[PDB]
Design a protein around this motif. Structure first.
Motif, PDB file in Angstrom:
ATOM      1  N   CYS A 262      98.217  44.191  -7.059  1.00 51.47           N
ATOM      2  CA  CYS A 262      97.957  44.465  -5.630  1.00 51.47           C
ATOM      3  C   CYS A 262      99.254  44.786  -4.970  1.00 51.47           C
ATOM      4  CB  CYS A 262      97.394  43.290  -4.950  1.00 51.47           C
ATOM      5  SG  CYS A 262      95.824  42.885  -5.759  1.00 51.47           S
ATOM      6  N   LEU A 263      99.312  45.942  -4.349  1.00 51.53           N
ATOM      7  CA  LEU A 263     100.460  46.417  -3.651  1.00 51.53           C
ATOM      8  C   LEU A 263     100.049  46.825  -2.141  1.00 51.53           C
ATOM      9  CD1 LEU A 263     102.951  49.145  -5.196  1.00 51.53           C
ATOM     10  CD2 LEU A 263     103.236  46.829  -4.042  1.00 51.53           C
ATOM     11  N   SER A 264     100.856  46.366  -1.193  1.00 58.91           N
ATOM     12  CA  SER A 264     100.536  46.537   0.223  1.00 58.91           C
ATOM     13  C   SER A 264     101.828  46.524   1.045  1.00 58.91           C
ATOM     14  CB  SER A 264      99.569  45.432   0.718  1.00 58.91           C
ATOM     15  OG  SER A 264     100.208  44.193   0.436  1.00 58.91           O
ATOM     16  N   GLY A 265     101.706  46.747   2.353  1.00 51.79           N
ATOM     17  CA  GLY A 265     102.882  46.750   3.224  1.00 51.79           C
ATOM     18  C   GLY A 265     103.339  48.171   3.551  1.00 51.79           C
ATOM     19  N   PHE A 266     104.528  48.560   3.089  1.00 54.99           N
ATOM     20  CA  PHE A 266     104.944  49.974   3.280  1.00 54.99           C
ATOM     21  C   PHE A 266     105.176  50.398   4.718  1.00 54.99           C
ATOM     22  CE2 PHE A 266     104.585  50.648  -1.101  1.00 54.99           C
ATOM     23  CZ  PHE A 266     103.339  50.195  -1.558  1.00 54.99           C
ATOM     24  N   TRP A 267     105.567  49.477   5.620  1.00 55.49           N
ATOM     25  CA  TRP A 267     105.889  49.981   6.972  1.00 55.49           C
ATOM     26  C   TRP A 267     106.980  51.045   6.914  1.00 55.49           C
ATOM     27  CZ3 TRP A 267     105.250  44.933   5.871  1.00 55.49           C
ATOM     28  CH2 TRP A 267     104.103  44.234   6.370  1.00 55.49           C
ATOM     29  N   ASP A 268     106.740  52.114   7.678  1.00 61.19           N
ATOM     30  CA  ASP A 268     107.790  53.143   7.893  1.00 61.19           C
ATOM     31  C   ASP A 268     108.185  53.775   6.546  1.00 61.19           C
ATOM     32  OD1 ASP A 268     108.187  52.439  10.598  1.00 61.19           O
ATOM     33  OD2 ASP A 268     109.299  50.615   9.967  1.00 61.19           O
ATOM     34  N   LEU A 287      95.385  48.950  -3.833  1.00 61.47           N
ATOM     35  CA  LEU A 287      96.493  49.623  -3.143  1.00 61.47           C
ATOM     36  C   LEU A 287      96.049  49.723  -1.673  1.00 61.47           C
ATOM     37  CD1 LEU A 287      99.281  51.065  -3.702  1.00 61.47           C
ATOM     38  CD2 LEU A 287      97.979  53.200  -4.257  1.00 61.47           C
ATOM     39  N   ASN A 288      96.916  49.216  -0.791  1.00 60.95           N
ATOM     40  CA  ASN A 288      96.695  49.330   0.682  1.00 60.95           C
ATOM     41  C   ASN A 288      97.828  50.129   1.325  1.00 60.95           C
ATOM     42  OD1 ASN A 288      96.551  49.027   3.478  1.00 60.95           O
ATOM     43  ND2 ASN A 288      96.141  46.820   3.407  1.00 60.95           N
ATOM     44  N   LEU A 289      97.542  51.373   1.641  1.00 61.86           N
ATOM     45  CA  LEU A 289      98.634  52.211   2.218  1.00 61.86           C
ATOM     46  C   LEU A 289      98.529  52.431   3.728  1.00 61.86           C
ATOM     47  CD1 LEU A 289      98.479  54.312  -0.845  1.00 61.86           C
ATOM     48  CD2 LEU A 289     100.870  53.757  -0.011  1.00 61.86           C
ATOM     49  N   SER A 290      97.823  51.564   4.380  1.00 63.21           N
ATOM     50  CA  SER A 290      97.288  51.856   5.640  1.00 63.21           C
ATOM     51  C   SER A 290      98.355  51.828   6.750  1.00 63.21           C
ATOM     52  CB  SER A 290      96.011  50.952   5.906  1.00 63.21           C
ATOM     53  OG  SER A 290      96.295  49.620   6.254  1.00 63.21           O
TER      54      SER A 290
END
Ligand code: IHP
Ligand code: CFA
Lengths: 571, 126, 13
Positions: A262-268, A287-290
C-alpha cells in the motif's frame, strides 16, 4: 444442553455481530452466557442507545466502535454543535471497562479530556482509531503517547486536529516499543523528526506508517532504512530539488521494502521523483494518488507497472486514455475512485468522461466498487456499464453539474440508472446524479432489493418518487436526500419503514414542520430531529418546510445534548 | 502403558503419553476409572489422542454431543477446541428458531421479551 | 454554486 463454559468456549469461536445477536435470542440461558463473553460491540449510531445500556448488558467488552454525525456532515450540511460527543461514553466506560483494548470512532466530537480519560483508565489500551473526528488537539495525543504503554495503533485518518505542537510525539518514552500502526497524515504541524526516527527505529513491529507531509521528501529514505518490514507507507511531501544523490537514495531505500502492499500520500509530487517508487510496484495492491497533481501521462507510466493492483484512488488527471491503459494492465481491480481535480469550475479542465469508466467496465472483470466524478454521462454508457459488471457492489457516480441530462440525447438519466439497478442484483450502495425524474425512483423501488445506502440530490418531481424508494427497497438501511421535491405525503405514508432503517436524512426538501410534529407523535421510537438555524419553528406557520429533518430509530429515546437549533418532535 | 476404565467397566490400554493428553488423567496419580465417559466415547477420544482430524468429526450429533462433554471432563484442550469450533460452525449464519431446531432448545421468551431483545440487537448492535 | 455541492471535501465553495 451442557454446561457453562462449554457454551462459553463455543461462543468464543463466534465473532460476527449478527451471529452473537442470534445466539443471544435462542433461549434465556444463551442470552446470559453471551452477554458475558461478548468481546466487542458495534454502535452504528451513538444516539441509538445509551452507554448505561451497553455497559450493563455486555460487561466484558474489550473493543468498542461508535459513529456519530450522519454522512452529510462531510458536505458540511450539519451546523457545528449538533452533537456526536464521545465524552459521556468514555466517562461511563472508564469505570466499567477496565480491561478495554480498542476504541474506534467515526464522525464524533472528541476532546482532550476524552483522550486523557482513556489514557489513564485503560491500562491495556491497544488501538485508537479516530476517523473524521474533531475537538481535540496535539495536547490530547501527547497524553496518549506519554501514558499508553501498550499502544499498538494510532490512526488519525481524516481528522481535524487543533494543531498545537509537533512536540507531542516525543512523549513516547524510550521504553515504548509496541507500535504496529501510526497514521499521521491529517496533521499540519510537524513532528520532531529525530524523535520520529528513534520511534520507528525501536518498534520492530511497525507495519503501517502514514506521514505527515511536513516530513519532506528528502527525509523519507532515512525512515525507510529504519523500517524495511513496512506493509503500508504514506509518504510525506513528495517534492525536492531535482538531484541524483537524493533520487538514488530514495530508490535504494524503497526497493529495500520488499513487503509494501500500500502506497499513499504524494503531496505536491514532482514527476521527476515518482519513478523511485517503481520497483515497489510489481507488488502493490493499493495505490492512492489522490493528492498527486501529476499529468495523465506520468500516472500511466506508473500504472503500467502495478499488475496486482486491486484498489486505485486517483485524480481525474488520469483521463480517458489513462483509464483505458488501466483496463488493460490491472486485471485484478476491485475498486476505482476517481476524484475531481477542479470540482468548482464548470468547464472541463480534463479530458475525463463516461468513456474511461466504460473502458474499465469492460476490462476489469472483478471491479465491484466505483466512485466517479465527471462532467458528463449518458444513458448508453450506464447501460454498457451495467451490462459489463453485474457483479458491481458499490456504485457512486457524481456528475458535477446539478441537473445535467444525457448530453448526446438530452434525456434524463433514468434508464441508465434503471439499468445499473436492474442488472446489478447485489448492488448494496448507490449514489446517483444528473437529470432524474420520478421514474428512476421507480426503478430503484422495483429492482434495488439489496440496496442498503442510497444518496441523492436535485432529483425527482414529486412525493411518488421517495415513496417508491421507502416502498420497494427491502434492504434499505440509510436513505439521505438533499434538495428534492419529497415531503410530507411520502414520508408519513411510509412512516413505519423508518423503524427498519438506521436513519433518514432530508435537507432542503419540502417537509413541513407540521408533518415533523405528526411523525414524532405517530412514532415515539423515532427521534425525529428538526435542525434549522432560523429560530424556533412556531416562528413560522407549520405549513413551512424546515431546513433539515434527521430521523433515526432508537432505544434511548430523545437525547440530552441537543443545541439551540435542534428540536425533537417527541413531547 | 496406563489402563483406562470406561463407565461401562471395560478396559483400555494406551501408552504413557496418550493417557497424559488429558489433564484430568494426569492429575489422578489399579487402572484409572472414568465414571463419566462411556467406552464408545472413550474409544474415539483415544483415536484422537493417538493421532495427535476432519472426517473424524464426520460423526453425528448425539455423538459430538458426548464428545464435547468428555473432552471437558478429561480436560483435553485441543479436542475441546476442535469439537467447540465444530458446534460453532453449526451456529453461524443461522437464525434463533433454526439454532433452536438444530439443538432441541425450547424457547422460554415471552412474545414481549423476545422483541425487546431483537429489538436492542438490531437497533443498537448491528 | 450550491452549498455542499458537489459533494467533496475540498476547500472552496
Ligand atoms: O457498514 P456501514 O456502517 O454501512 O459503513 C459504511 C461502509 O463502511 P465499512 O468499511 O465500515 O463497511 C462503507 O464501506 P463501502 O460502502 O465503501 O463498502 C463506508 O464507505 P467508504 O468505503 O467510502 O469509507 C461508509 O462510509 P461513508 O458513508 O462515509 O462513505 C460507511 O458508512 P457510515 O460510516 O457513513 O455508516
Ligand atoms: O457518493 C459520493 O460520495 C459522491 O456522489 C454523491 C454524494 C452525495 C449525493 Cl447526494 C449524491 C452523489 Cl452522486
Amino acid at each position: 444442553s451442557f454446561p457453562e463454559e462449554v457454551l462459553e468456549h463455543v461462543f468464543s469461536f463466534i465473532q460476527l455481530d449478527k451471529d452473537r445477536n442470534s445466539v443471544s435470542l435462542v433461549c434465556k440461558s444463551w442470552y446470559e452466557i453471551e452477554r458475558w463473553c461478548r468481546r466487542k460491540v458495534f454502535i452504528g449510531n451513538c444516539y441509538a442507545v445509551s452507554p448505561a445500556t451497553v455497559i450493563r448488558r455486555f460487561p466484558k467488552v474489550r473493543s468498542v466502535e461508535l459513529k456519530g454525525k450522519p454522512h452529510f456532515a462531510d458536505f458540511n450540511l450539519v451546523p457545528d454543535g449538533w452533537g456526536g460527543y464521545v465524552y459521556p461514553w468514555i466517562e461511563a466506560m472508564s469505570s466499567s471497562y477496565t480491561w478495554l483494548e480498542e476504541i474506534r470512532l467515526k464522525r464524533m466530537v472528541v476532546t482532550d479530556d476524552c483522550l486523557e480519560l482513556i489514557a489513564k483508565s485503560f491500562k491495556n489500551f491497544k488501538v485508537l482509531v479516530l476517523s473524521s473526528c474533531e475537538g481535540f488537539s496535539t495536547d490530547g495525543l501527547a497524553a496518549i503517547a506519554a501514558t499508553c504503554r501498550n499502544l499498538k495503533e494510532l490512526d488519525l485518518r481524516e481528522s481535524d486536529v487543533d494543531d498545537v505542537s509537533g512536540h507531542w510525539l516525543s512523549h513516547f518514552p524510550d521504553t515504548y516499543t509496541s507500535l504496529v500502526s501510526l497514521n499521521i497524515s491529517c496533521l499540519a504541524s510537524e513532528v520532531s523528526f529525530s524523535a520520529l526516527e528513534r520511534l520507528v527505529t525501536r518498534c520492530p513491529n511497525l507495519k503501517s506508517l502514514k506521514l505527515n507531509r511536513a516530513v519532506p521528501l528528502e527525509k523519507l529514505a532515512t525512515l525507510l532504512q529504519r523500517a524495511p518490514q513496512l506493509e503500508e507507507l504514506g509518504t510525506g511531501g513528495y517534492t525536492a530539488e531535482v538531484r541524483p544523490d537524493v533520487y538514488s537514495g530514495l530508490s535504494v531505500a524503497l526497493s529495500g521494502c520488499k513487503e509494501l502492499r500500500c502506497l499513499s500520500g504524494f503531496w505536491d509530487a514532482v514527476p521527476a521523483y515518482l519513478p523511485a517508487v517503481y520497483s515497489v510496484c510489481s507488488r502493490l495492491t493499493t495505490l492512492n494518488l489522490s493528492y498527486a497533481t501529476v499529468q495523465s501521462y506520468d500516472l500511466v507510466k506508473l500504472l503500467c507497472q502495478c499488475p496486482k493492483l486491486q484498489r486505485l484512488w486517483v485524480l481525474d488527471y488520469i483521463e480517458d486514455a489513462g483509464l483505458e491503459v488501466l483496463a488493460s494492465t490491472c486485471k485484478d481491480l476491485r475498486e476505482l475512485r476517481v476524484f475531481p481535480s477542479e470540482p468548482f469550475v464548470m468547464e472541463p479542465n480534463v479530458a475525463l468522461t463516461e468513456q474511461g469508466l466504460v473502458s474499465v467496465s469492460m476490462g476489469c472483470p472483478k471491479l465491484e466498487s466505483v466512485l466517479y466524478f465527471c462532467r458528463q454521462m449518458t444513458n448508453a454508457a450506464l447501460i454498457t456499464i451495467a451490462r459489463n459488471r453485474p457483479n458491481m457492489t458499490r456504485f457512486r457516480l457524481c456528475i458535477i453539474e446539478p441537473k445535467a441530462p444525457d448530453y448526446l440525447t438530452l434525456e434524463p438519466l433514468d434508464i441508465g440508472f434503471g439499468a445499473i439497478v436492474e442488472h446489478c442484483k447485489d448492488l448494496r450502495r448507490l449514489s446517483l446524479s444528473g437529470l432524474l425524474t420520478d421514474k428512476v425512483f421507480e426503478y430503484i423501488g422495483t429492482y434495488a432489493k439489496k440496496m442498503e445506502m442510497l444518496s441523492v440530490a436535485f432529483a425527482g418531481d414529486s412525493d411518488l418518487g421517495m415513496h417508491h424508494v421507502l416502498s420497494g427497497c427491502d434492504s434499505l438501511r440509510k436513505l439521505e436526500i438533499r434538495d428534492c421535491p419529497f415531503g410530507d405525503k411520502a414520508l408519513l405514508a411510509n412512516a413505519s419503514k423508518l423503524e427498519t432503517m438506521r436513519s433518514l436524512w432530508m435537507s432542503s426538501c419540502s417537509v413541513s414542520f407540521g408533518a415533523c410534529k405528526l411523525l414524532g407523535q405517530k412514532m415515539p421510537k423515532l427521534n425525529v430531529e428538526v435542525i434549522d438555524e432560523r429560530g424556533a419553528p412556531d416562528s413560522r406557520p407549520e405549513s413551512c418546510p424546515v431546513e433539515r429533518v434527521f430521523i433515526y430509530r432508537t432505544v434511548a429515546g430523545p437525547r440530552f445534548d441537543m443545541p439551540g437549533f435542534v428540536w425533537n418532535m417527541d413531547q | 502403558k496406563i489402563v483406562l476404565k470406561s463407565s461401562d467397566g471395560e478396559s483400555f490400554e494406551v501408552e504413557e503419553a496418550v493417557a497424559l493428553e488429558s489433564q484430568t488423567i494426569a492429575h489422578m496419580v489399579n487402572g484409572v476409572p472414568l465414571p463419566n465417559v462411556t467406552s464408545k466415547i472413550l474409544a474415539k477420544v483415544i483415536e484422537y489422542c493417538k493421532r495427535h482430524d476432519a472426517d473424524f468429526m464426520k460423526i453425528d450429533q448425539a455423538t459430538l454431543f458426548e464428545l464435547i462433554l468428555a473432552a471437558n471432563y478429561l480436560n483435553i484442550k485441543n479436542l475441546l477446541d476442535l469439537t467447540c469450533q465444530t458446534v460453532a460452525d453449526m451456529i453461524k449464519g443461522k437464525t434463533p428458531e433454526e439454532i433452536r431446531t438444530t439443538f432441541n432448545i425450547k424457547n422460554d421468551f415471552t412474545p414481549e421479551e423476545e422483541e425487546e431483545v431483537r429489538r436492542e440487537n438490531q437497533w443498537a448492535f448491528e | 454554486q450550491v452549498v455542499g455541492w458537489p459533494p467533496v471535501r475540498n476547500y472552496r465553495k
